[PDB]
Amino acid sequence: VGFSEVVDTYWLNQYVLNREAYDYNTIQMNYDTTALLSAPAVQQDYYKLFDGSNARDRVLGNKARITVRVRSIQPNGRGQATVR
Amino acid sequence: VGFSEVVDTYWLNQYVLNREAYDYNTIQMNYDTTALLSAPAVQQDYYKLFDGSNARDRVLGNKARITVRVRSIQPNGRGQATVRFTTQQHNSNGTVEAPQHQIATIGYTYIGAPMRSSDRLLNPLGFQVTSYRADPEILNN
Amino acid sequence: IQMNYDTTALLSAPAVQQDYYKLFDGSNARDRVLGNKARITVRVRSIQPNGRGQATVRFTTQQHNSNGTVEAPQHQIATIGYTYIGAPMRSSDRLLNPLGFQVTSYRADPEILNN
Amino acid sequence: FTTQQHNSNGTVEAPQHQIATIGYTYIGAPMRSSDRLLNPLGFQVTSYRADPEILNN
Numbered sequence: 001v002g003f004s005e006v007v008d009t010y011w012l013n014q015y016v017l018n019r020e021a022y023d024y025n026t027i028q029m030n031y032d033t034t035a036l037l038s039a040p041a042v043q044q045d046y047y048k049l050f051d052g053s054n055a056r057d058r059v060l061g062n063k064a065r066i067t068v069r070v071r072s073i074q075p076n077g078r079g080q081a082t083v084r
Numbered sequence: 085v086g087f088s089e090v091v092d093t094y095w096l097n098q099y100v101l102n103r104e105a106y107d108y109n110t111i112q113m114n115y116d117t118t119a120l121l122s123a124p125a126v127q128q129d130y131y132k133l134f135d136g137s138n139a140r141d142r143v144l145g146n147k148a149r150i151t152v153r154v155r156s157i158q159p160n161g162r163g164q165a166t167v168r169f170t171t172q173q174h175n176s177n178g179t180v181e182a183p184q185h186q187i188a189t190i191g192y193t194y195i196g197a198p199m200r201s202s203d204r205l206l207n208p209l210g211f212q213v214t215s216y217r218a219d220p221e222i223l224n225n
Numbered sequence: 226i227q228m229n230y231d232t233t234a235l236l237s238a239p240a241v242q243q244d245y246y247k248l249f250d251g252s253n254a255r256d257r258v259l260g261n262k263a264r265i266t267v268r269v270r271s272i273q274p275n276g277r278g279q280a281t282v283r284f285t286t287q288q289h290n291s292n293g294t295v296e297a298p299q300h301q302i303a304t305i306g307y308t309y310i311g312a313p314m315r316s317s318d319r320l321l322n323p324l325g326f327q328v329t330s331y332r333a334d335p336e337i338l339n340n
Numbered sequence: 341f342t343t344q345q346h347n348s349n350g351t352v353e354a355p356q357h358q359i360a361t362i363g364y365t366y367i368g369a370p371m372r373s374s375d376r377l378l379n380p381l382g383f384q385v386t387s388y389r390a391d392p393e394i395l396n397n
Contacts, residue, residue, distance in 0.1 A: 002087030009224025017219060025191035025215035029160045069219055090312055090323040097320055154320070201392070205269070270394020275361075285396035300396060 008081060009073040011037065016083050019046060021068040022060050092165060092192075093157040095121065095211040100167050100188050103130060104218070105152040106144050120198075120207045123214045148175040163192050163214070168221070185223060191215030235313075235322045238329045263290040278307050278329070283336070300338060306330030357395060363387030 015037050018030035031050070035043045050057050060066065075081040099121050102114035115134070119127045134141050144150065152171045159165040167190060172183040195210040230249070234242045249256050259265065267286045274280040282305060287298040310325040344355040367382040 006223055006225025010222050011224065013222040013224065023191075023215060023217070026164055026189050026217075028162070029164055029166075029189075067217065070222060073222065073224065090319045094320055094323050156316075157320075201271075205272070268396060270396030271392055273389075273391035275389070283394050283396065298397070 005075050008075055012073050012081050012083050013070045016070055017068045020066065022056055022066040024060070024062040024065070089159050091209070092159055095209065096157050096165050096167050096190055096192070097154045099190065099211070099213060100154055100169055100218070101152045103216075104150065104169070104171055104186075104188075106140055106150040108144070108146040108149070117206055120203055121211045121213060122216075123212050126213045126216055129216065144173075146176075148173055150174075165190050165192070167218075185221035186218050187221050188216065188218035232321055235318055236326045236328060237331075238327050241328045241331055244331065259288075261291075263288055265289075280305050280307070282333075300336035301333050302336050303331065303333035357393035358390050359393050360388065360390035 015034065018037075019034045021030060023030075031046075034046050038046060049055070070083060072084045073081055099118065102121075103118045105114060107114075115130075118130050122130060133139070150171060150173055152169060154167060154169040156168045157165055167188040168185075169188065170183050170185050173181040191214045193212055193214055195212050197208055197210055198204050230245075233245050237245060248254070265286060265288055267284060269282060269284040271283045272280055282303040283300075284303065285298050285300050288296040306329045308327055308329055310327050312323055312325055313319050341360065342355050342357050345353040363386045365384055365386055367384050369380055369382055370376050
């Protein structure tokens with residue numbers, strides 16, 4: 001049975017925007033996307049932002065939302081870039 | 085060891101194109117259509133784009149126009165999809181501005197068939213945007 | 226027009242598509258007569274189905290132009306024979322006609338306003 | 341044809357415009373006094389529909 005700069009700046013932008021932004025209505029995709037674009041260490045740091053009494057899910061919840069936009073990204077080396 | 089979307093993308097396209105686009109000559113239909121395909125919260129956000137001194141109606145007016153086209157839409161969950169599209173500005177002097185790339189995130193549902201002839205002939209399915217945002221795409225290619 | 230043109234073809238049986246394409250051919254082509262000097266605005270007032278793939282469309286039309294003038298509006302009635310061919314299998318078609326609407330017969334005559 | 345609604349509070353609704361399509365025949369004179377004094381010709385509708393008129397004027 002069983003036998004049968006352009007590219008990096010895009011990812012850096014989408015990562016920051018989705019990571020930092022928040023909307024009760026779309027966050028499940030941004031949340032999973034951020035994790036998909038994060039090393040387990042990073043994923044955990046991110047997941048923790050939605051934990052405890054100060055969780056983004058409780059602080060913003062469905063009462064407030066965060067809008068994020070990237071102005072400029074410039075790579076600076078060997079796996080490293082700055083996002084403004 | 086050896087053992088080892090069609091309908092929603094249409095509405096999302098038509099919504100973004102009509103919402104983001106502008107032409108003095110056709111905007112009344114795109115404007116009403118956008119509202120018809122929007123939750124009151126969303127409708128208000130949209131209506132406000134035509135208000136004040138920076139209103140699309142005053143900035144573009146009948147001097148400049150916006151052309152919008154959608155490249156690709158991919159649903160990602162439970163009332164949510166990503167729309168990848170472009171936009172450009174044309175004007176009365178015959179010039180064209182460089183095209184921009186944008187990505188919209190749309191939260192949506194359907195409210196069923198409407199009960200007015202002026203609505204059913206535009207949105208029979210009941211498509212409704214409940215949340216909307218669109219950011220510039222950064223072409224880090 | 227490029228989108229309306231392709232959309233019309235997308236919603237038309239080959240026989241109908243050809244009838245439509247021909248309106249843009251020859252010296253009397255819409256592309257030469259209207260070109261970029263004049264434009265046509267169309268709005269539908271009412272549609273009522275009457276049978277088995279057939280409906281009546283009551284609509285109006287008017288011509289606008291580059292000199293800022295407008296011709297008196299005309300009234301027309303279309304008779305449309307139609308079916309559906311199901312969902313298309315190309316992204317360029319499904320994002321325009323997912324239902325498969327297709328006109329199999331088409332005519333539109335002037336309305337005589339005997340009011 | 342046209343149609344309008346009036347009511348007990350003395351108000352009147354805006355008139356609407358409609359168009360009927362009538363399929364018909366005649367069945368000849370009826371054989372009852374209560375019918376011949378109303379439809380002696382035998383008029384009979386065999387199919388009927390009426391849709392709103394769209395005043396695209």
